[PDB]
Coordinates of C-alpha atoms and ligand atoms in Angstrom, one line a residue:
Chain A
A1 CA 2.1 -28.4 25.2
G2 CA 4.0 -28.6 21.9
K3 CA 3.6 -26.7 18.6
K4 CA 3.6 -27.7 14.9
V5 CA 5.1 -25.5 12.3
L6 CA 4.7 -25.6 8.5
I7 CA 7.2 -23.7 6.4
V8 CA 6.1 -23.1 2.8
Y9 CA 9.4 -22.4 1.0
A10 CA 9.8 -20.9 -2.4
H11 CA 13.4 -20.7 -3.7
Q12 CA 15.2 -22.7 -6.4
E13 CA 18.6 -22.7 -4.7
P14 CA 19.5 -24.4 -1.4
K15 CA 22.6 -22.2 -1.0
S16 CA 20.5 -19.0 -1.4
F17 CA 19.9 -16.4 1.3
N18 CA 16.3 -17.7 1.4
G19 CA 17.6 -21.3 1.8
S20 CA 19.7 -20.1 4.8
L21 CA 16.7 -18.4 6.4
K22 CA 14.6 -21.5 5.9
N23 CA 17.3 -23.7 7.4
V24 CA 17.8 -21.4 10.3
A25 CA 14.1 -21.6 11.0
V26 CA 14.1 -25.4 10.9
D27 CA 17.2 -25.5 13.2
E28 CA 15.8 -23.1 15.8
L29 CA 12.3 -24.5 15.8
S30 CA 13.6 -28.0 15.9
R31 CA 15.9 -27.2 18.8
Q32 CA 12.9 -25.8 20.6
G33 CA 11.2 -29.2 20.3
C34 CA 8.7 -28.0 17.8
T35 CA 7.3 -30.4 15.1
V36 CA 8.5 -29.0 11.8
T37 CA 7.4 -29.6 8.2
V38 CA 8.7 -27.9 5.1
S39 CA 7.0 -27.7 1.7
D40 CA 9.8 -27.0 -0.7
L41 CA 7.7 -26.0 -3.6
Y42 CA 10.3 -26.0 -6.4
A43 CA 11.7 -29.4 -5.2
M44 CA 8.2 -30.7 -5.3
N45 CA 7.6 -29.2 -8.7
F46 CA 4.4 -27.9 -7.2
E47 CA 1.6 -27.3 -9.7
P48 CA 0.7 -23.6 -9.7
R49 CA -2.1 -23.5 -12.3
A50 CA -5.7 -23.6 -11.2
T51 CA -7.3 -26.0 -13.7
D52 CA -10.0 -28.7 -14.0
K53 CA -7.3 -31.3 -13.3
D54 CA -7.7 -30.2 -9.7
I55 CA -11.0 -32.1 -9.5
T56 CA -11.3 -35.8 -10.2
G57 CA -15.0 -36.3 -9.6
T58 CA -18.1 -35.6 -11.5
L59 CA -18.2 -31.8 -12.2
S60 CA -21.1 -29.7 -10.9
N61 CA -21.4 -28.2 -14.4
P62 CA -19.4 -30.0 -17.1
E63 CA -20.6 -27.4 -19.6
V64 CA -19.1 -24.2 -18.1
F65 CA -16.1 -24.6 -15.8
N66 CA -16.1 -22.4 -12.6
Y67 CA -12.9 -23.1 -10.6
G68 CA -14.3 -21.8 -7.3
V69 CA -17.5 -23.7 -7.5
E70 CA -15.9 -27.0 -8.6
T71 CA -13.2 -26.9 -6.0
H72 CA -15.6 -26.1 -3.2
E73 CA -17.8 -29.0 -4.2
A74 CA -14.7 -31.3 -4.7
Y75 CA -13.5 -30.4 -1.2
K76 CA -16.8 -31.4 0.4
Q77 CA -17.0 -34.6 -1.7
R78 CA -13.2 -35.3 -1.3
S79 CA -12.5 -35.4 -5.0
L80 CA -9.7 -32.8 -5.0
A81 CA -6.3 -33.6 -6.6
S82 CA -4.1 -35.3 -3.9
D83 CA -1.4 -32.7 -4.1
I84 CA -3.9 -30.1 -2.8
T85 CA -5.2 -32.3 0.0
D86 CA -1.6 -33.2 1.0
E87 CA -1.0 -29.5 1.6
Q88 CA -4.3 -29.0 3.4
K89 CA -3.3 -31.7 5.8
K90 CA -0.1 -29.9 6.7
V91 CA -2.0 -26.6 7.2
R92 CA -4.8 -28.2 9.2
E93 CA -2.3 -29.6 11.7
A94 CA 0.0 -26.5 11.9
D95 CA -0.2 -24.0 14.7
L96 CA 2.1 -21.6 12.7
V97 CA 2.7 -21.3 8.9
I98 CA 5.8 -19.5 7.8
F99 CA 6.1 -18.4 4.2
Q100 CA 9.8 -18.1 3.1
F101 CA 10.3 -16.4 -0.2
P102 CA 12.1 -13.7 -2.3
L103 CA 9.8 -10.9 -3.3
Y104 CA 8.8 -11.2 -7.0
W105 CA 7.1 -8.2 -8.4
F106 CA 5.9 -6.9 -5.0
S107 CA 4.4 -10.3 -4.3
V108 CA 5.2 -14.0 -4.0
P109 CA 6.8 -16.1 -6.7
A110 CA 4.2 -17.7 -9.0
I111 CA 4.8 -21.2 -7.6
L112 CA 3.9 -19.9 -4.2
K113 CA 1.0 -17.9 -5.5
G114 CA -0.2 -21.2 -7.0
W115 CA -0.1 -22.8 -3.6
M116 CA -2.3 -20.1 -2.2
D117 CA -4.7 -20.2 -5.2
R118 CA -5.1 -24.0 -5.0
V119 CA -4.7 -25.0 -1.4
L120 CA -6.9 -22.3 0.3
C121 CA -10.2 -23.3 -1.2
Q122 CA -13.7 -22.7 0.0
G123 CA -14.8 -25.2 2.6
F124 CA -11.3 -25.6 3.8
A125 CA -9.8 -22.2 4.5
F126 CA -13.0 -20.2 4.6
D127 CA -16.8 -20.4 4.1
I128 CA -19.5 -17.9 3.0
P129 CA -20.2 -16.8 5.6
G130 CA -17.0 -17.6 7.5
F131 CA -14.2 -15.3 6.5
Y132 CA -11.8 -12.7 7.9
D133 CA -12.1 -12.9 11.7
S134 CA -14.5 -15.9 11.1
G135 CA -12.2 -17.7 8.7
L136 CA -11.8 -21.4 9.1
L137 CA -8.1 -21.2 9.9
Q138 CA -8.8 -19.1 12.9
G139 CA -6.6 -19.9 15.9
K140 CA -3.6 -20.4 13.5
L141 CA -0.7 -18.0 13.1
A142 CA 0.9 -17.0 9.8
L143 CA 4.1 -15.1 9.1
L144 CA 5.7 -13.8 5.9
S145 CA 9.5 -14.0 5.8
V146 CA 10.5 -12.0 2.7
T147 CA 13.8 -11.0 1.1
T148 CA 14.1 -8.1 -1.3
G149 CA 16.3 -6.6 -4.0
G150 CA 15.4 -3.1 -3.0
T151 CA 16.8 -1.4 0.1
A152 CA 14.9 -0.4 3.2
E153 CA 15.3 3.2 2.2
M154 CA 13.6 2.5 -1.1
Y155 CA 10.7 0.8 0.8
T156 CA 9.6 3.9 2.7
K157 CA 6.7 6.3 2.2
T158 CA 8.8 8.8 0.4
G159 CA 10.8 6.1 -1.2
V160 CA 10.6 5.0 -4.8
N161 CA 9.1 1.7 -3.9
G162 CA 6.7 3.0 -1.2
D163 CA 6.5 1.7 2.3
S164 CA 7.2 -2.0 2.7
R165 CA 3.8 -2.5 4.3
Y166 CA 2.0 -1.4 1.2
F167 CA 2.9 -4.6 -0.8
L168 CA 2.1 -6.8 2.2
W169 CA -1.6 -5.9 1.9
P170 CA -2.8 -8.6 -0.7
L171 CA -0.9 -11.3 1.2
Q172 CA -1.6 -10.5 4.8
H173 CA -5.1 -9.1 4.5
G174 CA -6.6 -10.3 1.2
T175 CA -5.3 -13.8 1.8
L176 CA -4.2 -14.8 5.3
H177 CA -6.6 -12.6 7.4
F178 CA -9.4 -13.6 5.0
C179 CA -8.8 -17.2 5.9
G180 CA -8.9 -16.5 9.6
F181 CA -5.1 -16.4 10.3
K182 CA -3.8 -14.2 13.0
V183 CA -0.9 -12.5 11.3
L184 CA 2.5 -12.1 13.0
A185 CA 4.7 -9.2 12.1
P186 CA 6.6 -9.8 8.8
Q187 CA 10.3 -10.6 8.7
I188 CA 11.7 -8.5 5.9
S189 CA 15.4 -9.1 5.1
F190 CA 16.2 -6.1 2.9
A191 CA 18.6 -6.3 0.0
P192 CA 20.9 -9.1 1.1
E193 CA 22.7 -9.0 -2.3
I194 CA 23.8 -5.5 -1.6
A195 CA 24.5 -6.2 2.0
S196 CA 28.0 -7.1 3.3
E197 CA 29.1 -10.5 4.6
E198 CA 28.6 -9.3 8.2
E199 CA 25.3 -7.6 7.4
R200 CA 24.0 -10.8 5.8
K201 CA 25.0 -13.0 8.7
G202 CA 23.4 -10.3 10.9
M203 CA 20.0 -10.6 9.2
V204 CA 20.1 -14.4 9.4
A205 CA 21.0 -14.2 13.1
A206 CA 18.2 -11.7 13.7
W207 CA 15.7 -14.2 12.2
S208 CA 16.9 -17.1 14.3
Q209 CA 17.0 -14.8 17.4
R210 CA 13.4 -13.7 16.8
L211 CA 12.2 -17.3 16.4
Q212 CA 13.5 -18.0 20.0
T213 CA 10.5 -16.0 21.3
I214 CA 8.1 -16.3 18.4
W215 CA 5.5 -18.1 20.6
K216 CA 5.3 -15.0 22.9
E217 CA 4.5 -12.6 20.1
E218 CA 1.1 -11.0 19.5
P219 CA -0.3 -10.7 16.0
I220 CA -0.5 -7.4 14.2
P221 CA -3.8 -5.5 13.7
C222 CA -4.3 -6.6 10.1
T223 CA -6.1 -3.4 9.1
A224 CA -5.9 -0.7 6.5
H225 CA -4.5 1.6 9.1
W226 CA -1.6 -0.7 10.0
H227 CA -0.7 -1.1 6.3
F228 CA -1.3 2.5 5.1
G229 CA -1.7 4.7 8.1
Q230 CA -3.7 7.8 7.2
Chain B
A1 CA 0.8 4.2 -38.2
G2 CA -1.9 1.9 -36.7
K3 CA -1.7 0.3 -33.2
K4 CA -0.7 -3.1 -31.9
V5 CA -2.4 -4.6 -28.9
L6 CA -1.5 -7.7 -26.9
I7 CA -4.1 -9.2 -24.6
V8 CA -2.7 -11.5 -21.9
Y9 CA -5.8 -13.5 -20.8
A10 CA -6.0 -15.7 -17.8
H11 CA -9.3 -17.7 -17.4
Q12 CA -10.0 -21.4 -17.9
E13 CA -13.5 -21.0 -19.3
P14 CA -14.3 -19.4 -22.7
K15 CA -17.9 -18.8 -21.7
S16 CA -16.9 -16.9 -18.6
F17 CA -17.4 -13.2 -17.9
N18 CA -13.7 -12.8 -18.4
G19 CA -13.9 -14.7 -21.7
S20 CA -16.6 -12.3 -22.8
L21 CA -14.6 -9.2 -21.8
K22 CA -11.6 -10.6 -23.7
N23 CA -13.8 -11.3 -26.8
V24 CA -15.4 -7.8 -26.7
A25 CA -11.9 -6.3 -26.6
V26 CA -10.8 -8.4 -29.6
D27 CA -14.0 -7.5 -31.5
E28 CA -13.8 -3.8 -30.8
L29 CA -10.1 -3.4 -31.3
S30 CA -10.2 -5.5 -34.5
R31 CA -13.1 -3.4 -35.8
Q32 CA -11.0 -0.3 -35.3
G33 CA -8.4 -1.7 -37.5
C34 CA -5.9 -2.5 -34.7
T35 CA -3.5 -5.4 -34.9
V36 CA -4.6 -7.8 -32.1
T37 CA -2.8 -10.7 -30.4
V38 CA -4.1 -12.8 -27.5
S39 CA -2.0 -15.0 -25.2
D40 CA -4.6 -17.4 -23.7
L41 CA -2.4 -18.6 -20.9
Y42 CA -4.4 -21.6 -19.8
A43 CA -5.0 -22.8 -23.4
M44 CA -1.2 -22.5 -23.8
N45 CA -0.5 -24.4 -20.6
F46 CA 1.8 -21.6 -19.9
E47 CA 4.6 -22.5 -17.5
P48 CA 4.4 -20.3 -14.3
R49 CA 7.5 -21.6 -12.5
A50 CA 10.7 -19.6 -12.6
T51 CA 13.3 -22.4 -13.0
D52 CA 16.7 -23.2 -14.6
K53 CA 14.8 -24.6 -17.6
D54 CA 14.1 -21.0 -18.6
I55 CA 17.7 -20.9 -19.8
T56 CA 18.8 -22.9 -22.9
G57 CA 22.3 -24.3 -23.2
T58 CA 24.6 -23.9 -20.3
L59 CA 24.2 -21.7 -17.2
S60 CA 26.7 -18.9 -16.4
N61 CA 27.1 -20.4 -12.9
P62 CA 26.1 -24.0 -12.5
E63 CA 27.4 -23.9 -8.9
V64 CA 24.8 -21.7 -7.4
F65 CA 21.6 -21.0 -9.4
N66 CA 20.5 -17.3 -9.3
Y67 CA 17.3 -17.0 -11.4
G68 CA 17.7 -13.2 -11.9
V69 CA 21.3 -13.2 -13.0
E70 CA 20.9 -16.3 -15.2
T71 CA 17.9 -15.0 -17.0
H72 CA 19.5 -11.5 -17.5
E73 CA 22.6 -13.2 -19.0
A74 CA 20.4 -15.5 -21.1
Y75 CA 18.5 -12.6 -22.5
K76 CA 21.7 -10.8 -23.6
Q77 CA 23.1 -14.0 -25.0
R78 CA 19.8 -15.0 -26.8
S79 CA 19.5 -18.2 -24.7
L80 CA 16.1 -17.9 -23.1
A81 CA 13.4 -20.6 -23.4
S82 CA 11.2 -20.1 -26.5
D83 CA 8.0 -19.7 -24.6
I84 CA 9.5 -16.7 -22.8
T85 CA 11.0 -15.2 -26.0
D86 CA 7.7 -15.7 -27.9
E87 CA 5.9 -13.5 -25.3
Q88 CA 8.7 -10.9 -25.3
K89 CA 8.3 -10.5 -29.1
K90 CA 4.5 -9.9 -28.6
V91 CA 5.2 -7.3 -25.9
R92 CA 8.0 -5.6 -27.8
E93 CA 5.8 -5.1 -30.8
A94 CA 2.7 -4.0 -28.8
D95 CA 1.7 -0.4 -28.2
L96 CA -0.8 -1.6 -25.5
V97 CA -0.9 -4.6 -23.3
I98 CA -4.3 -5.5 -21.7
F99 CA -4.3 -8.0 -18.9
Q100 CA -7.7 -9.7 -18.5
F101 CA -8.1 -11.8 -15.4
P102 CA -10.3 -12.6 -12.4
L103 CA -8.9 -11.4 -9.1
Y104 CA -7.2 -14.3 -7.2
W105 CA -6.2 -13.4 -3.6
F106 CA -6.1 -9.7 -4.2
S107 CA -3.8 -10.4 -7.2
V108 CA -3.4 -12.2 -10.5
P109 CA -4.0 -15.9 -10.9
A110 CA -0.7 -17.8 -10.5
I111 CA -0.4 -18.6 -14.2
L112 CA -0.4 -14.9 -15.0
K113 CA 1.9 -14.2 -12.1
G114 CA 4.2 -16.6 -13.8
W115 CA 4.0 -14.7 -17.1
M116 CA 5.1 -11.6 -15.2
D117 CA 7.9 -13.3 -13.3
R118 CA 9.3 -15.0 -16.4
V119 CA 8.6 -12.7 -19.3
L120 CA 9.6 -9.3 -17.7
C121 CA 13.3 -10.2 -17.1
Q122 CA 16.2 -7.8 -16.7
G123 CA 17.6 -6.6 -20.0
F124 CA 14.1 -6.8 -21.6
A125 CA 11.7 -5.0 -19.3
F126 CA 14.2 -3.0 -17.3
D127 CA 17.8 -2.6 -16.4
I128 CA 19.8 -1.1 -13.5
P129 CA 19.7 2.3 -15.3
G130 CA 16.2 2.1 -16.8
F131 CA 13.3 1.4 -14.3
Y132 CA 10.1 3.1 -13.4
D133 CA 9.9 6.2 -15.6
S134 CA 13.0 5.1 -17.3
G135 CA 11.7 1.5 -17.7
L136 CA 12.7 -0.2 -21.0
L137 CA 9.0 -0.6 -22.0
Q138 CA 8.5 3.1 -21.8
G139 CA 6.2 4.5 -24.5
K140 CA 4.0 1.4 -24.1
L141 CA 0.6 1.4 -22.4
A142 CA -0.7 -1.2 -19.9
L143 CA -4.2 -1.8 -18.6
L144 CA -5.5 -4.1 -16.0
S145 CA -9.0 -5.4 -16.7
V146 CA -10.0 -7.3 -13.5
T147 CA -13.2 -9.0 -12.3
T148 CA -13.9 -9.6 -8.6
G149 CA -16.0 -11.7 -6.3
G150 CA -16.4 -8.9 -3.9
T151 CA -18.7 -6.0 -4.4
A152 CA -17.7 -2.4 -5.0
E153 CA -19.0 -1.6 -1.5
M154 CA -16.7 -4.1 0.0
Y155 CA -13.8 -2.5 -1.9
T156 CA -14.1 0.8 -0.1
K157 CA -11.7 2.4 2.4
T158 CA -14.0 1.4 5.3
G159 CA -15.1 -1.8 3.5
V160 CA -14.0 -5.2 4.6
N161 CA -11.7 -5.5 1.6
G162 CA -10.4 -2.0 1.5
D163 CA -10.1 0.3 -1.5
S164 CA -9.5 -1.5 -4.7
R165 CA -6.6 0.8 -5.4
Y166 CA -4.8 -0.9 -2.5
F167 CA -4.5 -4.2 -4.3
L168 CA -3.5 -2.6 -7.6
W169 CA -0.2 -1.3 -6.1
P170 CA 1.9 -4.4 -6.6
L171 CA 0.6 -4.8 -10.1
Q172 CA 0.5 -1.2 -11.4
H173 CA 3.5 0.2 -9.5
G174 CA 5.8 -2.6 -8.5
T175 CA 5.4 -4.3 -11.8
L176 CA 4.1 -2.3 -14.7
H177 CA 5.4 1.2 -13.8
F178 CA 8.7 -0.4 -12.8
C179 CA 9.1 -1.7 -16.4
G180 CA 8.3 1.7 -17.9
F181 CA 4.7 1.1 -18.8
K182 CA 2.4 4.1 -18.9
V183 CA -0.5 2.8 -16.8
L184 CA -4.0 3.4 -18.0
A185 CA -6.9 3.5 -15.5
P186 CA -7.9 0.0 -14.4
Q187 CA -11.1 -1.5 -15.6
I188 CA -12.7 -3.2 -12.6
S189 CA -15.9 -5.2 -13.2
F190 CA -17.2 -5.8 -9.7
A191 CA -18.9 -9.1 -8.7
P192 CA -20.4 -10.1 -12.0
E193 CA -21.6 -13.3 -10.3
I194 CA -23.8 -11.4 -7.9
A195 CA -24.9 -8.7 -10.4
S196 CA -27.9 -9.3 -12.6
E197 CA -28.0 -9.9 -16.3
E198 CA -28.8 -6.3 -17.0
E199 CA -25.8 -5.2 -14.8
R200 CA -23.5 -7.8 -16.4
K201 CA -24.5 -6.6 -19.9
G202 CA -23.9 -3.1 -18.7
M203 CA -20.4 -3.9 -17.4
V204 CA -19.4 -5.5 -20.7
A205 CA -20.9 -2.6 -22.6
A206 CA -18.9 0.0 -20.6
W207 CA -15.8 -2.0 -21.5
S208 CA -16.5 -2.1 -25.2
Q209 CA -17.4 1.6 -25.2
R210 CA -14.3 2.5 -23.3
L211 CA -12.3 0.7 -25.9
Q212 CA -13.7 3.0 -28.5
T213 CA -11.7 5.9 -27.2
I214 CA -8.7 4.1 -25.5
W215 CA -6.2 5.9 -27.7
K216 CA -7.3 9.2 -26.4
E217 CA -6.7 8.3 -22.8
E218 CA -3.9 9.8 -20.6
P219 CA -2.0 7.5 -18.2
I220 CA -2.8 7.7 -14.5
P221 CA -0.2 9.2 -12.1
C222 CA 1.1 5.8 -10.8
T223 CA 2.2 7.1 -7.4
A224 CA 1.8 6.1 -3.8
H225 CA -0.6 9.1 -3.5
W226 CA -2.9 7.9 -6.3
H227 CA -3.1 4.5 -4.7
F228 CA -3.2 5.4 -1.0
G229 CA -3.5 9.2 -0.8
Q230 CA -6.5 11.5 -0.8
Ligands
FAD301 C1 11.1 -12.4 -11.2 C2 11.8 -11.5 -10.1 C3 11.0 -10.5 -9.6 C4 11.5 -9.7 -8.5 N1 10.8 -8.7 -8.0 C5 11.3 -7.8 -7.0 C6 10.5 -6.8 -6.4 O1 9.3 -6.6 -6.9 N2 11.0 -6.0 -5.4 C7 12.3 -6.2 -4.9 O2 12.8 -5.5 -4.0 N3 13.1 -7.3 -5.4 C8 12.6 -8.1 -6.4 N4 13.4 -9.1 -6.9 C9 14.7 -9.3 -6.3 C10 14.8 -10.6 -5.5 O3 14.0 -10.4 -4.3 C11 16.3 -11.0 -5.2 O4 17.0 -11.2 -6.4 C12 16.4 -12.3 -4.4 O5 16.3 -12.0 -3.0 C13 17.9 -12.9 -4.7 O6 18.0 -14.2 -4.0 P1 17.9 -14.4 -2.4 O7 18.1 -15.7 -1.9 O8 18.0 -13.2 -1.5 O9 19.5 -14.1 -2.4 P2 21.0 -14.8 -2.9 O10 20.3 -16.1 -2.8 O11 20.7 -13.6 -3.9 O12 21.6 -14.3 -1.5 C14 22.3 -13.1 -1.4 C15 23.7 -13.3 -1.0 O13 23.6 -13.9 0.3 C16 24.6 -14.9 0.5 N5 24.2 -15.8 1.6 C17 23.4 -16.9 1.5 N6 23.3 -17.5 2.7 C18 24.1 -16.8 3.5 C19 24.4 -17.0 4.9 N7 23.9 -17.9 5.7 N8 25.2 -16.0 5.5 C20 25.8 -15.0 4.7 N9 25.5 -14.8 3.4 C21 24.7 -15.7 2.9 C22 24.6 -15.5 -0.9 O14 25.8 -16.3 -1.2 C23 24.5 -14.3 -1.8 O15 25.7 -13.7 -2.3 C24 12.9 -9.9 -8.0 C25 13.6 -11.0 -8.6 C26 13.1 -11.8 -9.6 C27 13.9 -12.9 -10.2
FAD302 C1 -8.4 -19.0 -6.2 C2 -9.4 -17.9 -6.2 C3 -9.1 -16.7 -5.5 C4 -10.0 -15.6 -5.5 N1 -9.7 -14.4 -4.8 C5 -10.5 -13.3 -4.8 C6 -10.2 -12.1 -4.1 O1 -9.1 -12.0 -3.5 N2 -11.1 -11.1 -4.1 C7 -12.3 -11.1 -4.8 O2 -13.0 -10.2 -4.8 N3 -12.6 -12.3 -5.5 C8 -11.8 -13.3 -5.5 N4 -12.1 -14.5 -6.2 C9 -13.5 -14.5 -6.9 C10 -13.2 -14.5 -8.4 O3 -12.7 -13.2 -8.8 C11 -14.6 -14.7 -9.2 O4 -15.1 -15.9 -8.8 C12 -14.5 -14.8 -10.7 O5 -14.5 -13.5 -11.3 C13 -15.6 -15.6 -11.3 O6 -15.5 -15.8 -12.8 P1 -15.6 -14.6 -13.8 O7 -15.4 -14.9 -15.2 O8 -16.2 -13.3 -13.3 O9 -17.2 -14.9 -13.9 P2 -18.2 -16.2 -14.3 O10 -17.3 -16.5 -15.4 O11 -18.3 -16.3 -12.9 O12 -19.2 -15.0 -14.9 C14 -20.3 -14.5 -14.1 C15 -21.5 -14.6 -14.8 O13 -21.4 -13.8 -16.0 C16 -22.1 -14.5 -17.0 N5 -21.7 -14.0 -18.3 C17 -20.6 -14.4 -19.1 N6 -20.5 -13.7 -20.2 C18 -21.5 -12.8 -20.2 C19 -21.9 -11.8 -21.1 N7 -21.3 -11.5 -22.2 N8 -23.0 -11.0 -20.7 C20 -23.7 -11.2 -19.6 N9 -23.4 -12.2 -18.6 C21 -22.3 -12.9 -19.0 C22 -21.8 -16.0 -16.7 O14 -22.6 -16.9 -17.5 C23 -21.9 -16.0 -15.2 O15 -23.1 -16.4 -14.8 C24 -11.3 -15.6 -6.2 C25 -11.6 -16.8 -6.9 C26 -10.7 -17.9 -6.9 C27 -11.1 -19.2 -7.7
STL303 O1 15.5 -10.8 -12.9 C1 14.8 -9.8 -12.2 C2 13.5 -9.5 -12.6 C3 12.8 -8.4 -11.9 C4 13.5 -7.6 -10.9 C5 12.8 -6.5 -10.2 C6 13.4 -5.8 -9.2 C7 12.7 -4.7 -8.5 C8 13.4 -4.0 -7.5 C9 12.8 -2.9 -6.8 O2 13.5 -2.2 -5.9 C10 11.4 -2.6 -7.1 C11 10.7 -3.3 -8.1 O3 9.4 -3.0 -8.3 C12 11.3 -4.4 -8.8 C13 14.8 -8.0 -10.6 C14 15.5 -9.0 -11.2
STL304 O1 -11.7 -21.2 -4.5 C1 -11.7 -20.0 -3.9 C2 -10.5 -19.5 -3.2 C3 -10.5 -18.2 -2.6 C4 -11.6 -17.3 -2.8 C5 -11.5 -16.0 -2.1 C6 -12.6 -15.0 -2.3 C7 -12.4 -13.7 -1.7 C8 -13.5 -12.8 -1.8 C9 -13.4 -11.5 -1.2 O2 -14.5 -10.6 -1.3 C10 -12.2 -11.0 -0.6 C11 -11.1 -11.9 -0.5 O3 -10.0 -11.5 0.2 C12 -11.2 -13.3 -1.0 C13 -12.8 -17.8 -3.5 C14 -12.8 -19.1 -4.1
ZN305 ZN1 -6.4 -7.8 7.6
ZN306 ZN1 3.8 3.8 -10.1

C-alpha cells in the first residue's frame, strides 16, 4: 500500500528557505518509497489569470462570459486548456497535496492563487451539491507549509498580526475543505530571515522529522472554532 | 481641493454585475466632480507573477534572487518595471482606492492578488518603520467592493461559510491596514446570481447611493476584534 504526493511549490529561488523545505519533503517522502511529483509554478511559468483562454471549445454563452459556467461546462466536455487538465491529473492521483509557499499578504503568492482559481473548477473539485464534507476531493489530504516574515509572537491573538490560524481560514476552509480535502495541521516556519543559522536548520529538520510520521496524522477539525476559538 | 479615486477592477466581463458596480462607481464619482481612474486588470493583461522581470537593469544580488529585497532596492533606485510604477503613480495620487471584484476562494482573483503582491512593495506602501497605523499610504482610504456566490445566510457565524468578516482579515488587515490605509466598511453584494432582478437593482442602487456620501464616512476599527470579536 503505497502513497502518492503532489507538492505545489511557489518560490522563485531554488536556494531559498522555501526551496529547502520543498527539497526536504521530496527527499523524505522519496526515502519512504512514496511517489512524488512537484509542480514548480514559477519554473513552469504557470498562468494565474482566469480568462476565456482557459476554454477552447464552443462557449455556452459567447455574448456574456461567465468564467465559472464556462469552465464547468468545459470540464465536462473536456475542452479546458491543457495546463489546467495537467494539474488536475496530478491532483486526481495524489493521496496528499502539500502547498509550499512564502506568505504574501496573509495569503498565497498570486501564481499559486491562480493555480487554485483555475485548477479547482466545478465538476472536478466540487459539485453543487457536492462541497465541503461532500467535496469531490474527499479522501485526499492537504497540508499548507508556510514561511513568514513576521515572528510567532506577532502572530498571536494579542499580537499585531493576530493569531496565525486567522489567515489560514480562506485557504483551509474556503478552499481545501470546500473541495472535500481533509486538512492536516499547517507547518508554519516563522520568520526564517530573522532566525539564526541553527534556528533555520532546526525548522528544516522539524519539517523533515514531521514528514516521517505524516501518514499517521489525523486531520484538523476545519471549523470556525479551530480557527478563531470563541 | 477635490478628491482623486482609483478603482482597481478585476472582472473579465463588462456586462457582469461587477462591471455594473464599477460603472456605477465611475458614474457617481464622476458626477460629483471627482477625479476618477480605473485599472481594468484583465483588459490590461496585468502580470500577476512576482518575478525578477519586475526589476529593470541589473539585480542587486544575481546570485540568490530575493523578490522582497530586490523590489525594495529597485523602488529606491527607480528601477522597477513600468507596469508596477504606473500603478504606484495612480495609488500615490489617489485619496481613495476602491477594489471591485468577485470573491474567488474567500479572496481576490489571482490577477488582483498579483497587483497587491507587485504594486505594494517595501519603500512604497510600507517600510520597517512605517506599517499598519504608520503605513506609508496613511491618509488614504481603501474600500473592498466584493460580490459572492454564497448567500448572506451562508456567510454567518454558524453558516457553512462563516462570517464574511472572517475572509476580510487577510485583505483589510494583513494588506490594506498594514500599508497605512484607513479601511472603509466593505461593500458586500451577496449572491447576485441567485438574487432576483429587483434585488440586483437594489444592490447596485445601495452602492450608488452609498457613494453619494462616501467622503463623510469614518474608517472601521480594523482590529482582530472587529473581524472576530463580539
Ligand atoms: C509580496 C510579498 C508579501 C509578503 N507578505 C507577508 C505577510 O503578509 N506576512 C508575513 O509575515 N510575511 C510576508 N512576506 C515576507 C515573506 O514571507 C518572506 O520574505 C519570505 O519568506 C522570504 O523568503 P523565504 O524563502 O523564507 O526565505 P529566504 O529564502 O528569505 O530564506 C531565509 C534564509 O534562510 C536561509 N536558508 C535557506 N535554506 C536553508 C537551509 N537549508 N538551512 C539553513 N538556512 C537556510 C537563506 O539563505 C536565507 O538567508 C511577504 C513578502 C513579499 C515579497
Ligand atoms: C474561481 C472562482 C472562485 C470562487 N470562489 C468563491 C468563494 O470562495 N465564495 C463565494 O461565495 N463565491 C465564490 N465564487 C463565486 C463568484 O463570486 C460569482 O460567480 C461571481 O460573483 C459571478 O459574477 P458576478 O459579476 O457577480 O455576476 P454575473 O456577472 O454573475 O452577474 C449576476 C447577474 O447580474 C446581472 N446584472 C449585471 N449587471 C446588472 C445590473 N446593472 N442590474 C441588474 N442585474 C445586473 C447579470 O446579467 C447576471 O445575470 C467563485 C467563482 C470562481 C469563478
Ligand atoms: O517586499 C515585501 C512586500 C510586503 C511585505 C509584507 C510584510 C508583512 C509582515 C508582517 O509581519 C505582516 C504583514 O501584514 C505584512 C514584505 C516585503
Ligand atoms: O469555477 C469555480 C471554482 C470555485 C467555485 C467556488 C465557489 C464557492 C462558493 C461558496 O459559497 C463557498 C466557497 O468556499 C466556494 C465556484 C466556481
Ligand atoms: Zn473547514
Ligand atoms: Zn487592521
